[PDB]
Design a protein around this ligand. Sequence first.
Ligand SMILES: [Br-]
Ligand SMILES: [Br-]
Ligand SMILES: [Br-]
Lengths: 139, 120
Amino acid sequence: NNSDTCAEFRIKYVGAIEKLKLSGLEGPLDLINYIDVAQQDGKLPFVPPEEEFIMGVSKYGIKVSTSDQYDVLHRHALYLIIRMVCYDDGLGAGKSLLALKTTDASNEEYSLWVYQCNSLEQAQAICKVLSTAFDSVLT
Amino acid sequence: EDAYVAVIRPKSLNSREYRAKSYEILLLETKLSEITQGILDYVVETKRVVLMKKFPLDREASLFIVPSVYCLQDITARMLIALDKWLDERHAQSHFIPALFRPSPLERIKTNVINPAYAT
Ligand SMILES: [Br-]
Ligand SMILES: [Br-]
Ligand SMILES: [Br-]
């Protein structure tokens, strides 16, 4: 809700497809479709493991840690995030997934990161804070 | 290059058991960049496109599946029995068949956030 630039969220982690060359992956619909085909092929699971992670969103970008806060898995730097998309898994339980498309410093390779939120409300809050971050650093 | 398509719809779906009578079938053929846009344009003219298997001929022909919303229980020869087998297994995987028949990305997208640093 209106209006913050720094927030933490309890989420689940579906998985990642790291270091893609290109596949010609344009826009949010190609992204969702790609993740669908990965799930169908068994590269990503339909159901995430039970363990919860802490996602911190701020003007640095997105940080993912263990629920104990002890270990940092990843720092997704704001500069290297291309797109985040929130969408319904489409399965029955009506779960909301977040997909992040990130790139590397030289903009030569792409990676996809998929998370599961506990509600649609939470997924939208994460997107709001991320958007606000972008607009904030854009000044 | 060579392609084949098997179109299937249910009458279930979340069901534990695979009942071939719960599903119906319409195989088409087309030659060859865009594969996902390709087959889907061809179907409507006459949900997704799923590559299942390739079949050697002794040079290989591909079999795609197109989920949608002639009964399979009542029922090219190499491909039908392969589809019956493939469905028998995957129906005992959970979420698999529901995922096969789920709505399009556009029916499911909720939020789209882009980084202004990558504009134009
Ligand atoms: Br929370
Ligand atoms: Br893009
Ligand atoms: Br990097």
